[PDB]
Amino acid sequence: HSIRVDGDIILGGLFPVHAKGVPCGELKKEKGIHRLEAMLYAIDQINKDPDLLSNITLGVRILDTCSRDTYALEQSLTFVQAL
Amino acid sequence: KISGVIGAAASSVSIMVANILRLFKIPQISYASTAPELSDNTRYDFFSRV
Amino acid sequence: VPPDSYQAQAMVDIVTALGWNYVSTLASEGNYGESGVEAFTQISREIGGVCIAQSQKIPREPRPGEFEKIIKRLLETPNARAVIMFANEDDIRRILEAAKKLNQSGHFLWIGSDSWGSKIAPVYQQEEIAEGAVTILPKRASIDGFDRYFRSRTLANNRRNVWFAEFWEENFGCKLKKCTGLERIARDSSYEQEGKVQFVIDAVYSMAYALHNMHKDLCPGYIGLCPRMSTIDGKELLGYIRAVNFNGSAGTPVTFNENGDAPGRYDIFQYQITNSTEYKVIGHWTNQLHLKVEDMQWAHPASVCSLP
Ligand SMILES: N[C@H](C(=O)O)c1ccc(C(=O)O)c(C(=O)O)c1
Known part of the structure; x- marks a missing residue:
């Protein structure tokens, strides 16, 4: 439920893979998959x-x-968990 | 361990704090905030006001 | 991407170039639609020459009978035939179908934002009610390398994508009827590259150069990660991010101003219906409108509050 690729300098991304539901709904083939x-x-x-x-x-x-x-917001929290 | 928060005064401050207290499931009671958008249970569910 | 203040200015310029002065706005609840309409109103007042009849707001949770009520209020002023919209795809489609249900074809002249763009879905099976609409989009081009990359992907090679299984299931209409998984993209199913793909790649490259330049300054002649560059300070990296200049994937330059904004560059489309249907380019905006009136095709209609 999160994509890892290790490296020396790590970047973060936020994309709408799924639609708004239930917190989450249907897959977005174009707006979510193409962009990531x-x-x-x-x-x-x-x-x-x-x-x-x-x-x-x-x-x-x-x-x-x-x-x-x-x-x-929750995903941003997992971005900033180090501090 | 905090079990409850006596809220803020301005409505904007209360909204900003409530967005996090919702994630960590901590009740909030405010004494001066009157914005009508804090009555929505779907988005602000742990918020109460006197 | 440029902010919406430039888009509002372009909309005002289009309106004043088409000889219209009486318009009504329409916005969806949220930062986007409300901010865009507010910017349009402020600019239009400050410049003058354009008068706004009504401003309507689409609720986030539409109660029954909402769109018919919106259409009926719009018709309360019959000289306001131009509608400026900042609305989502579902709202646009529902507004158009409510107009079709109340039989108001040809009355309204639509001017939409990038939320309309060049999307078939809002206008599918409703071509007549949305014929002649003028829309705006930031400039963009397709990237061939990404097309090769996406058409070459399979289940075996693309395993780092956690959600790729669900995409495979939905794209081919199969379950992993059943499918053997040997299908190839763009051969057994429709495919077309998404619009903002370029804007994604550029964004990544904005980091890539901004870090690189930093390593050319704070690390003179030292290859690899530096002891001082181990702690990449965000405040310092902001300046390097905002002072970049390079050519993007499409070939157009990429720059940021002091506020972290891209310059405003737009294309203008019109939905035309000939004996096929398409979105046709009619002009552009690069801090000054360049619009062709000879290639516009309506069902030009005027939106004026009273004749001279
Ligand atoms: N109910 C409004 C609001 O929603 O912000 C409010 C909240 C707090 C105060 C305050 O600081 O005492 C005031 C005030 O200036 O009297 C007004």
């Missing part, structure tokens, strides 16, 4: 691309918003 796949593609390009962030790996921490404010 695009972020993963961009990360892969940067990592494979030389002379841009050379010898430094980018990872990802991708979460779901479910098109709601409170759910995104």
Whole structure:
């Protein structure tokens, strides 16, 4: 229920994979899947691309918003759990 | 461990605090906040006012 | 993406270019619609020359009979034929179908925001009631590399995506009738790349350069993560984020101003119905309106409060 890719510098993402329900509802094929796949593609390009962030790996921490404010607040909390 | 909060005064402050107290399930009672949008049980469920 | 103040300014410019001065607004509950309509009202008053008849608000939870009531209040002023909308797709579709039920075809002249855009769903099976609508969208282009990447994905190779199984189940209408899982995307099912994909990739690259430049300054000649760059300070990284300049995936430049905003650049579409139906580009906005009137096709109608 959360996408991990490890790396030296870690970025976070928030995308509406599911619709607003029940907290969550139906899958969004276009607004949710295409966009997170695009972020993963961009990360892969940067990592494979030389002379841009050379010898430094980018990872990802991708979460779901479910098109709601409170759910995104909880996911932001898991972003900031380190402090 | 906090079991209940005597709320804030301004409505905006109460809204901001309630968004988190909802997540951690802590009752809130306010003494001065009168915004009509705090009567919605779906979004502000642990909020009460005197 | 640019803020909605520029979109409101473009809408005012379109209205004043079309010779209209009597309009009614329509907004959905929330930050987006209300803020957009408020910006439109403030700009239109300050400039002058455009008068607003009514302002209506669509509730978040629509009670029965809401859309008919909204249409009937709009018809209380019959010289206000232009409606400026900041509304979601479902609200737009329901408003259009309520207009069709009350038989008001041709009365209203729609001007919608990026929530309308180029979407088939609001106008599907309701072409006549939504013919001639003018919409706005930030400029964008399709990316071929992402298309190759998405068409090459399978269940075996794409395992880092936790939700990919559900997408596979829904896309092909199968259960993992049953399916063997050997289906290929864009061959056995319809496919078209989403609109904001570019804006996602650009965003990622905005980090990628902003970090990189930092490592070129705070880490002179040291390869890899630095002892001082281990603690990446957010406040310092903000300046590097806001002072970037590079070419994006489409090839257009990417810049931020002092407030972290992209410059306003828009395309204008009109829904036209010929003997197929499409959204046709009729102009653009790059801090000054560039609109073609020779290529506009309505069922031009005027929205004026009284004739001279
Ligand atoms: N009910 C309103 C509100 O909802 O904000 C309110 C709340 C608190 C105060 C206060 O600080 O004493 C006041 C006031 O200025 O008298 C007004």
